[PDB]
Amino acid sequence: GHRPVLVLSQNTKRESGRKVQSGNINAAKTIADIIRTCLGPKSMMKMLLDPMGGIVMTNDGNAILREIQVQHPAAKSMIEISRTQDEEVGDGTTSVIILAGEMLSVAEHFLEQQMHPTVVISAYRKALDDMISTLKKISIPVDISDSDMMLNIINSSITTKAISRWSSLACNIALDAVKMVQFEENGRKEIDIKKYARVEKIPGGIIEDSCVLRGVMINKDVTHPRMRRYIKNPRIVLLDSSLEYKKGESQTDIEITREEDFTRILQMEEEYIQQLCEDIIQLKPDVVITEKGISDLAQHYLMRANITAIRRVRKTDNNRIARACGARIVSRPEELREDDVGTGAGLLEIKKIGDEYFTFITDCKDPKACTILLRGASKEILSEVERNLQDAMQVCRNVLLDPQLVPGGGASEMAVAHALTEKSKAMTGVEQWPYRAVAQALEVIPRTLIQNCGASTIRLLTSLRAKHTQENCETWGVNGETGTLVDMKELGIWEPLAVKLQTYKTAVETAVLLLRIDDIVSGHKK
Amino acid sequence: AAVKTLNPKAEVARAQAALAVNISAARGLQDVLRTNLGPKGTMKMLVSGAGDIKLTKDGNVLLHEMQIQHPTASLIAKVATAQDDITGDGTTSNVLIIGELLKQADLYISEGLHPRIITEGFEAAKEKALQFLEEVKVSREMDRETLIDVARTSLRTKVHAELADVLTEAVVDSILAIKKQDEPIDLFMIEIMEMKHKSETDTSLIRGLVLDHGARHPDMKKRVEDAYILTCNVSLEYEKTEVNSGFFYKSAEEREKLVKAERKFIEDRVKKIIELKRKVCGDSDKGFVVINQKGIDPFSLDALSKEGIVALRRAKRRNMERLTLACGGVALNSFDDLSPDCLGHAGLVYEYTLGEEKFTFIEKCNNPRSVTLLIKGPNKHTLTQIKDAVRDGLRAVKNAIDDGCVVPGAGAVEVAMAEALIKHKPSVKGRAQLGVQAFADALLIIPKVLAQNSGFDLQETLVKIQAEHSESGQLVGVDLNTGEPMVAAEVGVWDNYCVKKQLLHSCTVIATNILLVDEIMRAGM
Amino acid sequence: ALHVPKAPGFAQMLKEGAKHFSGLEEAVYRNIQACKELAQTTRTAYGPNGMNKMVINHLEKLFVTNDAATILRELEVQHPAAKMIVMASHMQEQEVGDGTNFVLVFAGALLELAEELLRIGLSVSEVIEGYEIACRKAHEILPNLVCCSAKNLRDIDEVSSLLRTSIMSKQYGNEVFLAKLIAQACVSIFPDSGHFNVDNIRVCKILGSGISSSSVLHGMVFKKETEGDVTSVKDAKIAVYSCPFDGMITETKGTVLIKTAEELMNFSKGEENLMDAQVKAIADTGANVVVTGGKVADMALHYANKYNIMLVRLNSKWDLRRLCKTVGATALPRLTPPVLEEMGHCDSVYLSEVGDTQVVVFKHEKEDGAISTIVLRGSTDNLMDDIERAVDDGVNTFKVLTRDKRLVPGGGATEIELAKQITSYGETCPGLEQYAIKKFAEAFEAIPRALAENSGVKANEVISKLYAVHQEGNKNVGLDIEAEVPAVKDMLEAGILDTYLGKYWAIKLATNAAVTVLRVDQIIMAKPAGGPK
Numbered sequence A: 001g002h003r004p005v006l007v008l009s010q011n012t013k014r015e016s017g018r019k020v021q022s023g024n025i026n027a028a029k030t031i032a033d034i035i036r037t038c039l040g041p042k043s044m045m046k047m048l049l050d051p052m053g054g055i056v057m058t059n060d061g062n063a064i065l066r067e068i069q070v071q072h073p074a075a076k077s078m079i080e081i082s083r084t085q086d087e088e089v090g091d092g093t094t095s096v097i098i099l100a101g102e103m104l105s106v107a108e109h110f111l112e113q114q115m116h117p118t119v120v121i122s123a124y125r126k127a128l129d130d131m132i133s134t135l136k137k138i139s140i141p142v143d144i145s146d147s148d149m150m151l152n153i154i155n156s157s158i159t160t161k162a163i164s165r166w167s168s169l170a171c172n173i174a175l176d177a178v179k180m181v182q183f184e185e186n187g188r189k190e191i192d193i194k195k196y197a198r199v200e201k202i203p204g205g206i207i208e209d210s211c212v213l214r215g216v217m218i219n220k221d222v223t224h225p226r227m228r229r230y231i232k233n234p235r236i237v238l239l240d241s242s243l244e245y246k247k248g249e250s251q252t253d254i255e256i257t258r259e260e261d262f263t264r265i266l267q268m269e270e271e272y273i274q275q276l277c278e279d280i281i282q283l284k285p286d287v288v289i290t291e292k293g294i295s296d297l298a299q300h301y302l303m304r305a306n307i308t309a310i311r312r313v314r315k316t317d318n319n320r321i322a323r324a325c326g327a328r329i330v331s332r333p334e335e336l337r338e339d340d341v342g343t344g345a346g347l348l349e350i351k352k353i354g355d356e357y358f359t360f361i362t363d364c365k366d367p368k369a370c371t372i373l374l375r376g377a378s379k380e381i382l383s384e385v386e387r388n389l390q391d392a393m394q395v396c397r398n399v400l401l402d403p404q405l406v407p408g409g410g411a412s413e414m415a416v417a418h419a420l421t422e423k424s425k426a427m428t429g430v431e432q433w434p435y436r437a438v439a440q441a442l443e444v445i446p447r448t449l450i451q452n453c454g455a456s457t458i459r460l461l462t463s464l465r466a467k468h469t470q471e472n473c474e475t476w477g478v479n480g481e482t483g484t485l486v487d488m489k490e491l492g493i494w495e496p497l498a499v500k501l502q503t504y505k506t507a508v509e510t511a512v513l514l515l516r517i518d519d520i521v522s523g524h525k526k
Numbered sequence B: 001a002a003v004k005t006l007n008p009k010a011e012v013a014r015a016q017a018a019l020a021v022n023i024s025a026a027r028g029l030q031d032v033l034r035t036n037l038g039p040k041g042t043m044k045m046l047v048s049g050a051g052d053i054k055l056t057k058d059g060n061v062l063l064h065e066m067q068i069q070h071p072t073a074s075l076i077a078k079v080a081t082a083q084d085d086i087t088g089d090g091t092t093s094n095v096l097i098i099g100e101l102l103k104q105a106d107l108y109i110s111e112g113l114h115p116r117i118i119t120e121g122f123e124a125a126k127e128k129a130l131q132f133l134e135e136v137k138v139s140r141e142m143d144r145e146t147l148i149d150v151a152r153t154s155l156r157t158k159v160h161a162e163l164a165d166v167l168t169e170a171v172v173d174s175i176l177a178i179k180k181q182d183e184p185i186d187l188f189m190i191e192i193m194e195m196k197h198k199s200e201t202d203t204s205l206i207r208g209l210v211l212d213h214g215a216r217h218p219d220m221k222k223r224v225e226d227a228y229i230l231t232c233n234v235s236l237e238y239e240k241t242e243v244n245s246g247f248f249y250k251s252a253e254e255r256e257k258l259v260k261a262e263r264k265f266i267e268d269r270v271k272k273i274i275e276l277k278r279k280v281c282g283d284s285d286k287g288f289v290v291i292n293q294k295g296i297d298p299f300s301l302d303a304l305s306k307e308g309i310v311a312l313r314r315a316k317r318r319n320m321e322r323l324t325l326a327c328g329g330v331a332l333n334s335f336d337d338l339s340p341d342c343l344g345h346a347g348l349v350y351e352y353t354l355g356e357e358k359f360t361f362i363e364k365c366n367n368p369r370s371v372t373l374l375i376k377g378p379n380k381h382t383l384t385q386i387k388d389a390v391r392d393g394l395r396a397v398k399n400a401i402d403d404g405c406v407v408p409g410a411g412a413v414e415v416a417m418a419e420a421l422i423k424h425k426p427s428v429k430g431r432a433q434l435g436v437q438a439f440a441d442a443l444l445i446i447p448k449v450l451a452q453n454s455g456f457d458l459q460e461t462l463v464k465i466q467a468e469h470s471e472s473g474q475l476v477g478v479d480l481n482t483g484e485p486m487v488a489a490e491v492g493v494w495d496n497y498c499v500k501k502q503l504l505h506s507c508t509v510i511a512t513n514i515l516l517v518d519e520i521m522r523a524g525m
Numbered sequence C: 001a002l003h004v005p006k007a008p009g010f011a012q013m014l015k016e017g018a019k020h021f022s023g024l025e026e027a028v029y030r031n032i033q034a035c036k037e038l039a040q041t042t043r044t045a046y047g048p049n050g051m052n053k054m055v056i057n058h059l060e061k062l063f064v065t066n067d068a069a070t071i072l073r074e075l076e077v078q079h080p081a082a083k084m085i086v087m088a089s090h091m092q093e094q095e096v097g098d099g100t101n102f103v104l105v106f107a108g109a110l111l112e113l114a115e116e117l118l119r120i121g122l123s124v125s126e127v128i129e130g131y132e133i134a135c136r137k138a139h140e141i142l143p144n145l146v147c148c149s150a151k152n153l154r155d156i157d158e159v160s161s162l163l164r165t166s167i168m169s170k171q172y173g174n175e176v177f178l179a180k181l182i183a184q185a186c187v188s189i190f191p192d193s194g195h196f197n198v199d200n201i202r203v204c205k206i207l208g209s210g211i212s213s214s215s216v217l218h219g220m221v222f223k224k225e226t227e228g229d230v231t232s233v234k235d236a237k238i239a240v241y242s243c244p245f246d247g248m249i250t251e252t253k254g255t256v257l258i259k260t261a262e263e264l265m266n267f268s269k270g271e272e273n274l275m276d277a278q279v280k281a282i283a284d285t286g287a288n289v290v291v292t293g294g295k296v297a298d299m300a301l302h303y304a305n306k307y308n309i310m311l312v313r314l315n316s317k318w319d320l321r322r323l324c325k326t327v328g329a330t331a332l333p334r335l336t337p338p339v340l341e342e343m344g345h346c347d348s349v350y351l352s353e354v355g356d357t358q359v360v361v362f363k364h365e366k367e368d369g370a371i372s373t374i375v376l377r378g379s380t381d382n383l384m385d386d387i388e389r390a391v392d393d394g395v396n397t398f399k400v401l402t403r404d405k406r407l408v409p410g411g412g413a414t415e416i417e418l419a420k421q422i423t424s425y426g427e428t429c430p431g432l433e434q435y436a437i438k439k440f441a442e443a444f445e446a447i448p449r450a451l452a453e454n455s456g457v458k459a460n461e462v463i464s465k466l467y468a469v470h471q472e473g474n475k476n477v478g479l480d481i482e483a484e485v486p487a488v489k490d491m492l493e494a495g496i497l498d499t500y501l502g503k504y505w506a507i508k509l510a511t512n513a514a515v516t517v518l519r520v521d522q523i524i525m526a527k528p529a530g531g532p533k
């Protein structure tokens, strides 16, 4: 016997000192190196094996990072910041990771050179503030009324994905969807593309046939074949309550003693259904769409009035239809009003694609919701196309909200680095060295672009750095396709200011978070 | 590796390893599926884990039923699944073209070339090839002869010669029967019914419906000559109240009265049906058939059979529309207001019993817009193979009718496409000409595989065909009986234009995406 | 779609337990990381303020020391690149005797800066060429950095001052006393002939009285006892015999064939009389001490006692040879009495007790001879072992000074001057090798950085001050140990000097090891299997 006595429980480890900092920085560098080669217009794609047996062939950094599992907590923090960048702005996920990895890599030097992490953190925060100032300075305005400028911005956003082959069609689709989704009510502007901009993937066909509809498409068919599958100018009526006969909430029981009470009860059930159908018909609609089941007898009474019925649509699909055709979902048909009747859909067609029926409510006038019908080679191709379309729509929304633009291809990075170095020339304290280190660490984006392009990093980067020292060279970047220095006033690669601001903020703050950390303790039970 | 450093139990293939793995998987799939192409191909035999026997020749069925656990194989299987879902043909050609594109691309990548240039060449070659395919298609009025030729060119590749000859007439007649002018063809209106009592050549087309269920009452007539069809969706069995009624009585007489009075609701609808039947046909010459999507309890069955009415219960949901289009009635969800004008008509209804199963035939319809295909064979695997073949034939005929054009087959179209691509290659700038050449060589796989399956050699047959095409300019294919060049237009070897376009698009897209994959991870655990 | 197969080709043909690392990131960066780790482990023992490290090897033997070579020997290093660095360190130790920690620090700095150069876009070949050019420049510069020469080795005070710096890194607190001991021991050795033998310095470790009680003995000391009864001679006349102190026997087979009773009765008497005659013949030459390399017979011992002869039995042949060297006798192969030329002479041989250990001392009154012994006292075995390592370092430094008398300033002064000169040179040559040359120059900063870190001061202040001072022109200025604030002072006046050969060989070996590690591209490791030794 005599079991050992000790302060902390077993399986409780603890390491401290330079080892923890080095391990955290190495984990961040490994996370960066995982997706270092997936940046730029010449990025290669990666194939990821889902544990559930799926395959994710993707170029996006966030999907790659979220599809892998790590044990080191610093890698978990890096994945979390990647997800945060993806959610906040939409793109820039594989740039912020690289930036954070480089910043931690250059901070490791000062950590090893007897400098306390707090000084490094203060220098990092001053550098971040000056980066924000420089980006706000070098930005240019954009008028959202010019469709060509918006298309160019979306193209520059999607030149690095696999959809650059059909870039023109993709940009048109994304811009149209964002414009359709844009809404304002009660003075509250709203661009909510995660609910009212739906992407539907139907494998087969050709990618060139993909388009955005002026309406909503659902995978539903008429309840009864006698119903019309083609109505010219339908009057939409939406419901979210069953058209059947159902038990009440209170516990209720009948007690039948007379002979004719059973038939009377059944007849009153039928009459209740008939009354509901008559209440619906009194508005004289053309179709009825419900989120809950519709009884066969109700279907008969609806067909008697020449009304097409769709049985069970989802909540989100019903909301999209309401936004598109101008209807208003109601629960009790007794309280139906003419305002709730959905007029504005220019055509309702129920056609067959492949071996399945699909319902189209397209041709709407002024629709506030849309569906993007994607057709392609297979499921994974369509998934990647959908991810690229999400990136494009997020970029379009960011530009619509924040109409300033900054040069791409590392031109902004080099301009900010040069401005930071010029400002650091004036400081005299010990904080200047980490400040300049961050300034030059910001140059990783053009270096990675040159490395991915296959060109030589050293001389190209040196020439670019020399070029940025002149009076007006803030728009000089690199070609990701030819490996040459070009003015981005000519190449036309521009990025939203919000995306760059979010990227720099997230990278610097992740570096700050991982610099503060020491004395890792693990193994304790909840 | 970085991933292995972060996750020790993770598998990683990077740089040339990913390309090698993907190309090896594609080559293995291609090698398996080479023998499928062409009518001279070899039947594959598939045994499942439960011992079920599957005789087939389709690329998609083979892909689904091979015991393969490879990622690239999964991607190619999904591509072929989409190909089958939309067009219904070209899966074997899909796999062959994907594998040959990957092999030809590797032939240049292994010499230090970068895959991006190959992909650019592939894109340019695909654009030119689509232009040429649009140029070469034959716009024709789809009469019966052309549809028969297309159905033959599918079914002979799928099944035996005589069986294919029978299925050609069956499929073409069925499609022409259900087809409406300037209206999309609905393939749900063709029942594919299986029976297992005759030879495979006994498969035929019935201008009506065959139902896998018969009358459940022995006293009902087994054969009705002139019938009136009542297609209904009304429950004719006892239904309990939704609100938990229960009965309360104080003596046996009250119990008897309540028992008699609890059948009145269903009895009213049965009486309505009987009154309609009596009014419509006052003699015994005409018949009355009731097909119900819901159950019919024995009491209602006896009541109906006492009036000379044949009642079928628990019919299929689509059978409502099938009977409405074929017989010509109105599917009723309630008997509130039923009139003789909602009754369908059938010129013959009879019951056929096969072992423990019973079938009902509804023939001699006036103008059946929906028909059925009766698959007959001695074995289950024979029935499955015939069903797959007729699916392929129906898809081919529907595609031929939809797209008013049709493309010469027998390997001519891709030979001409490759020659045109070679001619156009100098117009491509840079080193994408290598990708264009690889695309042309990959397109040339189909005549090669056809030559092997016919028992000939690639080099001699291919050079003969290409020389004939260059000298004459006609669309010359592969004669699988002699190996000489042959113009597929006269002999009636046709291919679907949509199938070729889908093949080009999907193969190019998937090959480009696979070639650009440089790193494979399995680190989700 | 749930497993990634191995790529066809070499990946599949690889053996079960083997590993294959190829490319830049998989191999070169990993090797640089391993070398950096090794340098990090060894760094904190550099300089006078280096801390001792207690290393327990696989045999449970305890080593406490701050000698880099010993630490590397007692560490079971597994990584091949770190193994090559350790081999370079051991080669430096064998060639010179001091500078191993310099080798590791310089190699680690060079490899880390090479990794930085590779990351910023340079190639391996260009980095290697730049490093070689910079090493050639440093070797050219080094002779111009010599501040003073030995100029005399027969002196005691001057030799002690010269050797103080070498044994200041080890045993920082008390180095003057050790310097005096090693100086006296080395001056006893090293006659008018220029040749100096390191092995001629003997170290005897006797526990008990602290290291301050150590002394230098001109002769040999053996932790043994005397076979006979005589225990002290004042006019020693050692006669050395490699043969056992017994009557020699045949080599095939000795059979005493007795045929009559008279032979049986007379055999033992005759044998004893013969042995007595031999011993008396030995003693009649004036010899009073007999040293034998083999077993001592009982009758031989009895007759040696009868004639007042001191018997010592040196079992090991090396001790016998060293005693022959120090006394002046020749190991006779038989038991014949020694002739005058082979006769051994010594001032005094006696049996003495030191602490609780019985020793036999062969002592010369003159301050000369062929071999000198340092008697090390202490309160711990590990402490005496560390003092012995320091003595070895000092003796090797004396040997180096005999080979070459040039000296260069220490305390990071030479490293800073080399860094400044190489940086100045590299700014003139155009091309991609200038980055490699500048990084090679910067790699010299790791020495003053390590010294400042171990001293408890801020390294950056010290480095900036050293650059400033060397910019005015004072090239003999290094960091000051006796200062809490970061401060610098002249090294020529303080007497803190480093041997020129040590720096030259250390730089050469470190850069050679770094270049050799960089040249490796692919690593094909076999299954470790066994190989316990």
Ligand SMILES: Nc1ncnc2c1ncn2[C@@H]1O[C@H](COP(=O)(O)OP(=O)(O)O)[C@@H](O)[C@H]1O
Pocket: A038, A039, A040, A041, A043, A060, A061, A091, A092, A093, A094, A095, A096, A156, A157, A159, A160, A407, A408, A409, A410, A449, A478, A479, A480, A481, A493, A495
């Ligand atoms: N044609 C181009 N030439 C040079 N650089 C480009 C080009 N197109 C995009 N870039 C650069 O590539 C970056 C986008 O790469 P991407 O893979 O989208 O990374 P992220 O997903 O982090 O945005 C942008 O910062 C932009 O500056």
Ligand SMILES: Nc1ncnc2c1ncn2[C@@H]1O[C@H](COP(=O)(O)OP(=O)(O)O)[C@@H](O)[C@H]1O
Pocket: B036, B037, B038, B039, B058, B059, B089, B090, B091, B092, B093, B094, B153, B154, B156, B157, B409, B410, B411, B446, B450, B477, B478, B479, B480, B493, B495
């Ligand atoms: N009678 C024939 N003579 C010559 N070639 C033919 C004949 N019938 C079919 N072919 C060719 O053989 C190929 C058959 O391919 P098939 O086995 O149907 O593959 P899939 O089922 O994937 O379409 C077609 O491309 C066609 O051009």
Ligand SMILES: Nc1ncnc2c1ncn2[C@@H]1O[C@H](COP(=O)(O)OP(=O)(O)O)[C@@H](O)[C@H]1O
Pocket: C045, C046, C047, C048, C050, C068, C098, C099, C100, C101, C102, C103, C165, C168, C169, C170, C409, C410, C411, C412, C451, C478, C479, C480, C481, C496, C498
């Ligand atoms: N009193 C001192 N003040 C400053 N530096 C010193 C002093 N004594 C020695 N050093 C420095 O310490 C270094 C020797 O370190 P050491 O621990 O001996 O490593 P190694 O054994 O590899 O030479 C020399 O380069 C010398 O410059």
Ligand SMILES: [Mg+2]
Pocket: A091, A092, A093, A157, A160
């Ligand atoms: Mg992006």
Ligand SMILES: [Mg+2]
Pocket: B089, B090, B091, B154, B157, B392
């Ligand atoms: Mg086919």
Ligand SMILES: [Mg+2]
Pocket: C098, C099, C100, C166, C169
């Ligand atoms: Mg030393």
